Design an enzyme around this catalytic site. Structure first.
Site, PDB file in Angstrom:
ATOM      1  N   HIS A 133       0.808  -1.212   0.000  1.00 57.15           N
ATOM      2  CA  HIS A 133       0.000   0.000   0.000  1.00 57.15           C
ATOM      3  C   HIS A 133       0.844   1.266   0.000  1.00 57.15           C
ATOM      4  O   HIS A 133       0.296   2.348  -0.238  1.00 57.15           O
ATOM      5  CB  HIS A 133      -0.933   0.025   1.219  1.00 57.15           C
ATOM      6  CG  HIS A 133      -2.034  -0.990   1.168  1.00 57.15           C
ATOM      7  ND1 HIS A 133      -2.849  -1.150   0.066  1.00 57.15           N
ATOM      8  CD2 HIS A 133      -2.451  -1.898   2.079  1.00 57.15           C
ATOM      9  CE1 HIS A 133      -3.722  -2.114   0.303  1.00 57.15           C
ATOM     10  NE2 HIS A 133      -3.509  -2.579   1.520  1.00 57.15           N
ATOM     11  N   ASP A 171      -2.305 -10.877  -1.942  1.00 55.87           N
ATOM     12  CA  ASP A 171      -2.969 -10.255  -0.805  1.00 55.87           C
ATOM     13  C   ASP A 171      -4.407  -9.919  -1.199  1.00 55.87           C
ATOM     14  O   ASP A 171      -4.692  -9.620  -2.363  1.00 55.87           O
ATOM     15  CB  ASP A 171      -2.198  -8.986  -0.412  1.00 55.87           C
ATOM     16  CG  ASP A 171      -2.684  -8.364   0.875  1.00 55.87           C
ATOM     17  OD1 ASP A 171      -3.764  -7.742   0.901  1.00 55.87           O
ATOM     18  OD2 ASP A 171      -1.969  -8.471   1.886  1.00 55.87           O
ATOM     19  N   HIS A 173      -6.121  -7.445  -0.631  1.00 54.53           N
ATOM     20  CA  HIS A 173      -6.272  -6.034  -0.973  1.00 54.53           C
ATOM     21  C   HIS A 173      -5.432  -5.666  -2.191  1.00 54.53           C
ATOM     22  O   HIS A 173      -4.364  -6.232  -2.431  1.00 54.53           O
ATOM     23  CB  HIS A 173      -5.862  -5.151   0.203  1.00 54.53           C
ATOM     24  CG  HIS A 173      -6.605  -5.454   1.461  1.00 54.53           C
ATOM     25  ND1 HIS A 173      -6.103  -6.284   2.441  1.00 54.53           N
ATOM     26  CD2 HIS A 173      -7.815  -5.040   1.901  1.00 54.53           C
ATOM     27  CE1 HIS A 173      -6.975  -6.375   3.430  1.00 54.53           C
ATOM     28  NE2 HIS A 173      -8.025  -5.630   3.126  1.00 54.53           N
ATOM     29  N   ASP A 264      -4.344 -12.694   3.720  1.00 47.63           N
ATOM     30  CA  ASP A 264      -5.637 -12.251   4.208  1.00 47.63           C
ATOM     31  C   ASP A 264      -6.793 -12.654   3.302  1.00 47.63           C
ATOM     32  O   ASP A 264      -7.947 -12.440   3.682  1.00 47.63           O
ATOM     33  CB  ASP A 264      -5.671 -10.733   4.459  1.00 47.63           C
ATOM     34  CG  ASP A 264      -4.886  -9.914   3.444  1.00 47.63           C
ATOM     35  OD1 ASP A 264      -4.476 -10.411   2.369  1.00 47.63           O
ATOM     36  OD2 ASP A 264      -4.704  -8.720   3.759  1.00 47.63           O
ATOM     37  N   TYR A 304      -4.024 -11.828   8.752  1.00 46.00           N
ATOM     38  CA  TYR A 304      -4.231 -11.462  10.150  1.00 46.00           C
ATOM     39  C   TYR A 304      -4.743 -12.574  11.064  1.00 46.00           C
ATOM     40  O   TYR A 304      -4.769 -12.365  12.280  1.00 46.00           O
ATOM     41  CB  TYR A 304      -5.164 -10.238  10.221  1.00 46.00           C
ATOM     42  CG  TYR A 304      -4.574  -9.194   9.331  1.00 46.00           C
ATOM     43  CD1 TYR A 304      -3.425  -8.513   9.729  1.00 46.00           C
ATOM     44  CD2 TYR A 304      -5.059  -8.979   8.033  1.00 46.00           C
ATOM     45  CE1 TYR A 304      -2.827  -7.582   8.893  1.00 46.00           C
ATOM     46  CE2 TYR A 304      -4.449  -8.063   7.193  1.00 46.00           C
ATOM     47  CZ  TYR A 304      -3.337  -7.368   7.634  1.00 46.00           C
ATOM     48  OH  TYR A 304      -2.707  -6.449   6.807  1.00 46.00           O
TER      49      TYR A 304
HETATM   50  O1  LIG Z   1      -4.079  -5.965   5.101  1.00 46.40           O
HETATM   51  C1  LIG Z   1      -4.323  -4.898   4.664  1.00 46.40           C
HETATM   52  N1  LIG Z   1      -3.721  -4.563   3.385  1.00 46.40           N
HETATM   53  O2  LIG Z   1      -2.846  -5.459   2.720  1.00 46.40           O
HETATM   54  C2  LIG Z   1      -5.282  -3.936   5.379  1.00 46.40           C
HETATM   55  C3  LIG Z   1      -6.444  -4.435   5.950  1.00 46.40           C
HETATM   56  C4  LIG Z   1      -7.340  -3.588   6.575  1.00 46.40           C
HETATM   57  F1  LIG Z   1      -8.473  -4.101   7.128  1.00 46.40           F
HETATM   58  C5  LIG Z   1      -7.098  -2.228   6.657  1.00 46.40           C
HETATM   59  C6  LIG Z   1      -5.941  -1.717   6.102  1.00 46.40           C
HETATM   60  F2  LIG Z   1      -5.709  -0.366   6.180  1.00 46.40           F
HETATM   61  C7  LIG Z   1      -5.044  -2.567   5.460  1.00 46.40           C
HETATM   62  F3  LIG Z   1      -3.915  -2.042   4.914  1.00 46.40           F
HETATM   63  K   LIG Z   2      -3.713  -8.115  -4.272  1.00 48.19           K
HETATM   64 ZN   LIG Z   3      -4.154  -7.067   2.724  1.00 48.63          ZN
END
Ligand SMILES: O=C(NO)c1cc(F)cc(F)c1F
Ligand SMILES: [K+]
Ligand SMILES: [Zn+2]
Ligand SMILES: [K+]
Length: 354
Positions: A133, A171, A173, A264, A304
Protein backbone atom coordinates in the site's frame (compact mmCIF):
# COMPACT_ATOMS: atom_id res chain seq x y z
CA UNK A 1 18.44 -26.67 -5.42
CA UNK A 2 18.38 -24.43 -2.34
CA UNK A 3 15.52 -22.40 -0.82
CA UNK A 4 16.41 -19.27 1.12
CA UNK A 5 14.50 -18.03 4.14
CA UNK A 6 14.86 -14.66 5.84
CA UNK A 7 13.36 -13.84 9.22
CA UNK A 8 14.51 -11.51 11.95
CA UNK A 9 12.83 -11.10 15.33
CA UNK A 10 13.80 -7.40 15.33
CA UNK A 11 10.88 -6.73 12.97
CA UNK A 12 8.50 -7.53 15.82
CA UNK A 13 9.53 -4.27 17.54
CA UNK A 14 7.16 -2.17 15.39
CA UNK A 15 3.99 -1.93 17.47
CA UNK A 16 0.76 -0.02 18.04
CA UNK A 17 1.01 1.85 21.29
CA UNK A 18 -2.66 2.94 21.46
CA UNK A 19 -4.23 -0.34 20.25
CA UNK A 20 -2.00 -3.24 21.26
CA UNK A 21 -4.50 -5.72 19.78
CA UNK A 22 -4.39 -4.14 16.31
CA UNK A 23 -4.32 -7.08 13.85
CA UNK A 24 -0.95 -6.12 12.28
CA UNK A 25 0.71 -7.84 15.26
CA UNK A 26 4.38 -8.38 15.99
CA UNK A 27 3.63 -12.07 16.44
CA UNK A 28 2.47 -12.36 12.81
CA UNK A 29 6.07 -13.05 11.80
CA UNK A 30 7.13 -15.04 14.88
CA UNK A 31 4.14 -17.34 14.41
CA UNK A 32 4.97 -18.03 10.76
CA UNK A 33 8.61 -18.67 11.69
CA UNK A 34 7.56 -21.00 14.52
CA UNK A 35 5.32 -22.98 12.17
CA UNK A 36 8.34 -23.44 9.89
CA UNK A 37 10.34 -24.77 12.86
CA UNK A 38 7.69 -27.20 14.05
CA UNK A 39 7.07 -28.50 10.49
CA UNK A 40 10.90 -28.95 10.21
CA UNK A 41 10.90 -26.73 7.11
CA UNK A 42 13.38 -24.23 8.57
CA UNK A 43 16.25 -26.72 8.70
CA UNK A 44 15.71 -27.46 4.99
CA UNK A 45 16.26 -23.79 4.01
CA UNK A 46 19.39 -21.69 3.78
CA UNK A 47 19.01 -18.86 6.27
CA UNK A 48 19.56 -15.49 4.54
CA UNK A 49 20.44 -12.66 6.96
CA UNK A 50 18.33 -9.56 7.31
CA UNK A 51 19.89 -6.15 6.81
CA UNK A 52 18.77 -2.53 6.89
CA UNK A 53 17.91 -1.00 3.56
CA UNK A 54 19.85 2.20 2.94
CA UNK A 55 18.26 5.58 2.28
CA UNK A 56 19.73 5.44 -1.22
CA UNK A 57 17.93 2.14 -1.83
CA UNK A 58 14.68 3.65 -0.50
CA UNK A 59 15.02 6.40 -3.10
CA UNK A 60 14.60 3.79 -5.85
CA UNK A 61 10.86 4.19 -5.27
CA UNK A 62 10.29 6.86 -2.60
CA UNK A 63 10.59 10.63 -2.44
CA UNK A 64 13.13 12.30 -0.17
CA UNK A 65 10.32 14.01 1.78
CA UNK A 66 8.63 10.67 2.53
CA UNK A 67 11.91 8.99 3.48
CA UNK A 68 12.90 11.86 5.77
CA UNK A 69 9.59 12.09 7.64
CA UNK A 70 9.41 8.34 8.34
CA UNK A 71 13.12 8.37 9.25
CA UNK A 72 12.45 11.12 11.81
CA UNK A 73 9.81 9.00 13.56
CA UNK A 74 12.64 7.04 15.23
CA UNK A 75 13.22 10.00 17.61
CA UNK A 76 9.63 11.27 17.78
CA UNK A 77 7.71 11.81 21.00
CA UNK A 78 4.47 9.82 21.49
CA UNK A 79 2.28 12.80 20.56
CA UNK A 80 4.39 13.32 17.42
CA UNK A 81 3.98 9.62 16.57
CA UNK A 82 0.22 9.68 17.08
CA UNK A 83 -0.33 12.80 15.02
CA UNK A 84 1.98 11.70 12.20
CA UNK A 85 0.32 8.30 11.92
CA UNK A 86 -3.06 10.01 11.83
CA UNK A 87 -1.98 12.00 8.75
CA UNK A 88 -2.07 8.76 6.73
CA UNK A 89 -4.80 6.28 5.86
CA UNK A 90 -4.57 3.46 8.46
CA UNK A 91 -1.06 3.84 9.88
CA UNK A 92 0.33 3.40 13.37
CA UNK A 93 3.94 4.34 14.17
CA UNK A 94 6.32 3.59 17.05
CA UNK A 95 9.96 4.55 17.57
CA UNK A 96 10.99 1.21 16.01
CA UNK A 97 8.79 1.37 12.89
CA UNK A 98 11.39 2.98 10.62
CA UNK A 99 14.06 0.41 11.48
CA UNK A 100 11.55 -2.42 11.07
CA UNK A 101 10.52 -1.14 7.63
CA UNK A 102 14.21 -0.88 6.67
CA UNK A 103 14.78 -4.47 7.83
CA UNK A 104 11.80 -5.76 5.84
CA UNK A 105 13.10 -4.13 2.66
CA UNK A 106 16.75 -5.09 3.18
CA UNK A 107 15.77 -8.67 3.98
CA UNK A 108 14.09 -8.88 0.59
CA UNK A 109 17.08 -7.27 -1.16
CA UNK A 110 19.41 -9.88 0.30
CA UNK A 111 16.96 -12.57 -0.80
CA UNK A 112 16.66 -11.18 -4.34
CA UNK A 113 20.45 -10.91 -4.51
CA UNK A 114 20.83 -14.53 -3.39
CA UNK A 115 18.41 -15.63 -6.11
CA UNK A 116 19.95 -13.51 -8.87
CA UNK A 117 23.52 -14.58 -8.03
CA UNK A 118 22.50 -18.24 -8.09
CA UNK A 119 23.15 -18.96 -4.41
CA UNK A 120 19.52 -20.03 -3.91
CA UNK A 121 16.87 -21.04 -6.42
CA UNK A 122 13.99 -19.32 -4.61
CA UNK A 123 13.29 -17.77 -1.24
CA UNK A 124 10.68 -16.76 1.31
CA UNK A 125 10.73 -13.50 3.31
CA UNK A 126 8.89 -13.47 6.66
CA UNK A 127 8.84 -9.70 7.18
CA UNK A 128 6.77 -6.87 8.64
CA UNK A 129 5.51 -4.13 8.38
CA UNK A 130 4.03 -4.89 4.95
CA UNK A 131 4.67 -2.82 1.85
CA UNK A 132 2.23 -2.93 -1.03
CA UNK A 133 0.00 0.00 0.00
CA UNK A 134 2.99 2.35 0.38
CA UNK A 135 3.22 5.03 -2.31
CA UNK A 136 6.19 6.97 -3.66
CA UNK A 137 5.31 9.91 -1.41
CA UNK A 138 3.12 8.52 1.39
CA UNK A 139 2.52 5.72 3.88
CA UNK A 140 -0.76 3.82 3.73
CA UNK A 141 -2.52 0.72 4.99
CA UNK A 142 0.02 -0.46 7.60
CA UNK A 143 2.85 0.07 5.05
CA UNK A 144 5.71 2.58 5.18
CA UNK A 145 7.91 1.62 2.21
CA UNK A 146 6.91 -0.57 -0.70
CA UNK A 147 9.10 -3.58 -0.01
CA UNK A 148 8.11 -5.50 -3.16
CA UNK A 149 8.46 -2.49 -5.47
CA UNK A 150 11.84 -1.64 -3.93
CA UNK A 151 13.00 -5.24 -4.37
CA UNK A 152 12.05 -5.14 -8.04
CA UNK A 153 14.10 -1.95 -8.54
CA UNK A 154 16.94 -3.32 -6.40
CA UNK A 155 16.98 -6.44 -8.59
CA UNK A 156 17.27 -4.25 -11.70
CA UNK A 157 20.02 -2.22 -10.03
CA UNK A 158 22.27 -5.29 -9.56
CA UNK A 159 21.50 -6.88 -12.94
CA UNK A 160 20.21 -4.60 -15.73
CA UNK A 161 17.72 -1.74 -15.68
CA UNK A 162 15.31 -3.60 -17.99
CA UNK A 163 15.31 -6.92 -16.07
CA UNK A 164 11.78 -8.30 -16.42
CA UNK A 165 10.22 -8.59 -12.95
CA UNK A 166 6.75 -10.05 -12.47
CA UNK A 167 4.98 -9.06 -9.25
CA UNK A 168 1.99 -11.26 -8.38
CA UNK A 169 0.00 -9.69 -5.55
CA UNK A 170 -2.37 -12.22 -3.99
CA UNK A 171 -2.97 -10.26 -0.81
CA UNK A 172 -6.74 -9.81 -0.61
CA UNK A 173 -6.27 -6.03 -0.97
CA UNK A 174 -5.19 -4.19 -4.10
CA UNK A 175 -1.57 -3.07 -3.95
CA UNK A 176 -2.30 0.54 -4.85
CA UNK A 177 1.28 1.62 -4.18
CA UNK A 178 2.79 -1.10 -6.33
CA UNK A 179 0.42 -0.35 -9.20
CA UNK A 180 1.21 3.36 -9.08
CA UNK A 181 4.98 2.88 -8.75
CA UNK A 182 5.08 0.80 -11.95
CA UNK A 183 2.07 2.27 -13.77
CA UNK A 184 4.26 3.65 -16.60
CA UNK A 185 6.73 0.75 -16.59
CA UNK A 186 6.90 -2.17 -19.03
CA UNK A 187 9.82 -3.86 -17.21
CA UNK A 188 7.74 -4.67 -14.12
CA UNK A 189 4.49 -6.49 -14.82
CA UNK A 190 2.09 -6.06 -11.89
CA UNK A 191 -0.73 -8.60 -11.51
CA UNK A 192 -3.08 -8.17 -8.54
CA UNK A 193 -6.03 -10.29 -7.44
CA UNK A 194 -8.16 -8.53 -4.86
CA UNK A 195 -11.54 -8.13 -3.27
CA UNK A 196 -12.96 -5.03 -4.93
CA UNK A 197 -16.74 -4.84 -4.40
CA UNK A 198 -17.16 -2.04 -6.96
CA UNK A 199 -14.59 0.03 -5.09
CA UNK A 200 -16.08 -0.38 -1.60
CA UNK A 201 -13.32 -2.63 -0.20
CA UNK A 202 -10.09 -1.19 1.23
CA UNK A 203 -8.15 0.71 -0.13
CA UNK A 204 -11.48 2.01 -1.53
CA UNK A 205 -10.32 3.17 -4.96
CA UNK A 206 -11.48 2.53 -8.51
CA UNK A 207 -7.78 2.37 -9.41
CA UNK A 208 -8.18 -1.34 -8.59
CA UNK A 209 -10.68 -2.08 -11.39
CA UNK A 210 -9.89 -4.26 -14.40
CA UNK A 211 -9.83 -1.35 -16.85
CA UNK A 212 -6.62 0.07 -15.36
CA UNK A 213 -4.19 -1.64 -17.75
CA UNK A 214 -1.20 0.68 -17.31
CA UNK A 215 -0.19 4.07 -18.67
CA UNK A 216 2.22 5.21 -21.35
CA UNK A 217 5.00 2.69 -21.90
CA UNK A 218 3.30 0.54 -19.27
CA UNK A 219 0.05 0.01 -21.17
CA UNK A 220 -0.78 -3.69 -20.82
CA UNK A 221 1.66 -4.22 -17.95
CA UNK A 222 -0.85 -3.67 -15.13
CA UNK A 223 -3.37 -6.48 -14.62
CA UNK A 224 -6.11 -6.02 -12.01
CA UNK A 225 -8.33 -9.02 -11.25
CA UNK A 226 -11.09 -7.54 -9.05
CA UNK A 227 -13.59 -9.76 -7.20
CA UNK A 228 -17.19 -8.68 -6.58
CA UNK A 229 -20.07 -10.27 -4.70
CA UNK A 230 -18.79 -13.61 -3.48
CA UNK A 231 -16.69 -15.29 -0.79
CA UNK A 232 -13.97 -16.25 -3.24
CA UNK A 233 -11.69 -19.20 -2.62
CA UNK A 234 -9.59 -21.86 -4.28
CA UNK A 235 -11.82 -22.44 -7.35
CA UNK A 236 -11.83 -18.74 -8.23
CA UNK A 237 -8.11 -18.21 -7.67
CA UNK A 238 -7.19 -21.33 -9.62
CA UNK A 239 -9.47 -20.18 -12.46
CA UNK A 240 -7.88 -16.73 -12.51
CA UNK A 241 -4.43 -18.33 -12.61
CA UNK A 242 -5.41 -20.64 -15.48
CA UNK A 243 -7.09 -18.02 -17.66
CA UNK A 244 -5.13 -14.86 -16.79
CA UNK A 245 -2.09 -14.94 -14.48
CA UNK A 246 -0.24 -17.81 -15.98
CA UNK A 247 -0.89 -17.14 -19.71
CA UNK A 248 0.07 -13.47 -19.27
CA UNK A 249 3.11 -14.27 -17.12
CA UNK A 250 4.37 -16.86 -19.61
CA UNK A 251 4.11 -14.37 -22.48
CA UNK A 252 5.95 -11.73 -20.42
CA UNK A 253 8.72 -14.26 -19.63
CA UNK A 254 9.86 -12.78 -16.31
CA UNK A 255 13.46 -13.17 -15.21
CA UNK A 256 12.41 -12.79 -11.57
CA UNK A 257 9.06 -13.37 -9.86
CA UNK A 258 8.12 -11.54 -6.68
CA UNK A 259 5.00 -12.57 -4.79
CA UNK A 260 3.33 -9.92 -2.71
CA UNK A 261 2.06 -12.76 -0.55
CA UNK A 262 -0.52 -11.47 1.86
CA UNK A 263 -2.51 -14.28 3.44
CA UNK A 264 -5.64 -12.25 4.21
CA UNK A 265 -7.64 -13.98 1.50
CA UNK A 266 -7.22 -17.09 3.67
CA UNK A 267 -10.04 -19.03 5.26
CA UNK A 268 -10.33 -17.68 8.80
CA UNK A 269 -8.94 -14.20 8.18
CA UNK A 270 -10.84 -11.69 10.36
CA UNK A 271 -10.74 -9.00 7.62
CA UNK A 272 -10.60 -10.46 4.12
CA UNK A 273 -13.79 -12.52 4.17
CA UNK A 274 -12.45 -15.07 1.66
CA UNK A 275 -11.68 -18.77 1.93
CA UNK A 276 -8.46 -19.62 0.10
CA UNK A 277 -6.98 -22.68 1.79
CA UNK A 278 -3.33 -23.46 2.57
CA UNK A 279 -3.46 -26.06 -0.19
CA UNK A 280 -4.76 -23.38 -2.55
CA UNK A 281 -1.79 -21.13 -1.78
CA UNK A 282 0.46 -24.15 -2.28
CA UNK A 283 -0.99 -24.64 -5.76
CA UNK A 284 -0.63 -20.95 -6.63
CA UNK A 285 3.01 -21.14 -5.50
CA UNK A 286 3.64 -24.33 -7.46
CA UNK A 287 2.34 -22.69 -10.64
CA UNK A 288 4.54 -19.61 -10.25
CA UNK A 289 7.67 -21.75 -9.86
CA UNK A 290 7.25 -22.79 -13.50
CA UNK A 291 8.25 -19.19 -14.41
CA UNK A 292 11.61 -17.38 -14.44
CA UNK A 293 13.53 -20.67 -14.26
CA UNK A 294 12.13 -21.06 -10.75
CA UNK A 295 13.41 -17.69 -9.50
CA UNK A 296 10.57 -16.88 -7.08
CA UNK A 297 10.70 -14.72 -3.94
CA UNK A 298 7.67 -14.90 -1.62
CA UNK A 299 7.25 -11.69 0.43
CA UNK A 300 4.84 -11.52 3.37
CA UNK A 301 2.28 -8.73 3.03
CA UNK A 302 -0.96 -8.83 5.05
CA UNK A 303 -2.86 -11.67 6.63
CA UNK A 304 -4.23 -11.46 10.15
CA UNK A 305 -5.35 -14.91 11.40
CA UNK A 306 -2.11 -16.07 13.03
CA UNK A 307 -2.95 -19.74 12.51
CA UNK A 308 -4.10 -19.24 8.90
CA UNK A 309 -1.08 -17.23 7.82
CA UNK A 310 1.29 -19.66 9.54
CA UNK A 311 -0.24 -22.70 7.84
CA UNK A 312 -0.55 -20.90 4.51
CA UNK A 313 2.91 -19.41 4.22
CA UNK A 314 4.55 -22.64 5.48
CA UNK A 315 2.80 -24.54 2.70
CA UNK A 316 4.22 -22.11 0.13
CA UNK A 317 7.73 -22.72 1.47
CA UNK A 318 7.10 -26.45 1.27
CA UNK A 319 6.34 -25.92 -2.38
CA UNK A 320 9.51 -23.88 -2.96
CA UNK A 321 11.48 -26.74 -1.36
CA UNK A 322 10.14 -29.07 -4.04
CA UNK A 323 7.48 -30.98 -2.15
CA UNK A 324 4.56 -32.37 -4.13
CA UNK A 325 1.41 -30.20 -4.18
CA UNK A 326 -1.33 -31.44 -1.86
CA UNK A 327 -4.80 -32.29 -3.13
CA UNK A 328 -7.54 -29.66 -3.29
CA UNK A 329 -11.20 -29.89 -2.23
CA UNK A 330 -16.94 -26.54 -5.74
CA UNK A 331 -18.39 -24.80 -8.80
CA UNK A 332 -16.90 -21.49 -9.87
CA UNK A 333 -18.98 -18.62 -8.60
CA UNK A 334 -20.51 -16.96 -11.64
CA UNK A 335 -19.43 -13.47 -10.56
CA UNK A 336 -15.86 -14.73 -10.62
CA UNK A 337 -16.30 -15.81 -14.23
CA UNK A 338 -17.65 -12.33 -14.97
CA UNK A 339 -14.53 -10.80 -13.43
CA UNK A 340 -12.23 -13.13 -15.38
CA UNK A 341 -14.15 -12.28 -18.55
CA UNK A 342 -13.80 -8.52 -17.97
CA UNK A 343 -10.04 -8.86 -17.53
CA UNK A 344 -9.70 -11.06 -20.62
CA UNK A 345 -11.50 -8.43 -22.68
CA UNK A 346 -9.30 -5.65 -21.32
CA UNK A 347 -5.98 -7.44 -21.83
CA UNK A 348 -6.51 -9.51 -25.00
CA UNK A 349 -5.28 -6.49 -27.05
CA UNK A 350 -1.94 -6.64 -25.19
CA UNK A 351 -1.38 -10.38 -24.72
CA UNK A 352 -1.84 -12.66 -27.73
CA UNK A 353 -2.07 -15.66 -25.38
CA UNK A 354 -5.55 -14.44 -24.37
O1 LIG B 1 -4.08 -5.97 5.10
C1 LIG B 1 -4.32 -4.90 4.66
N1 LIG B 1 -3.72 -4.56 3.38
O2 LIG B 1 -2.85 -5.46 2.72
C2 LIG B 1 -5.28 -3.94 5.38
C3 LIG B 1 -6.44 -4.43 5.95
C4 LIG B 1 -7.34 -3.59 6.58
F1 LIG B 1 -8.47 -4.10 7.13
C5 LIG B 1 -7.10 -2.23 6.66
C6 LIG B 1 -5.94 -1.72 6.10
F2 LIG B 1 -5.71 -0.37 6.18
C7 LIG B 1 -5.04 -2.57 5.46
F3 LIG B 1 -3.92 -2.04 4.91
K1 LIG C 1 -3.71 -8.12 -4.27
ZN1 LIG D 1 -4.15 -7.07 2.72
K1 LIG E 1 3.61 -2.02 -14.81
Amino acid sequence: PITGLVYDQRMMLHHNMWDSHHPELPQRISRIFSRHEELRLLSRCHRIPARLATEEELALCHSSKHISIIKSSEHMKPRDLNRLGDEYNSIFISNESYTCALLAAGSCFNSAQAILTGQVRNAVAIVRPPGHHAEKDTACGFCFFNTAALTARYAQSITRESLRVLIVDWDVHHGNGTQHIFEEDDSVLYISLHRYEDGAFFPNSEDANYDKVGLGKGRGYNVNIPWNGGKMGDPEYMAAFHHLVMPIAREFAPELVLVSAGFDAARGDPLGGFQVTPEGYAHLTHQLMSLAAGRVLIILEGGYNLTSISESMSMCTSMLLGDSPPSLDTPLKTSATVSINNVLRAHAPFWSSL
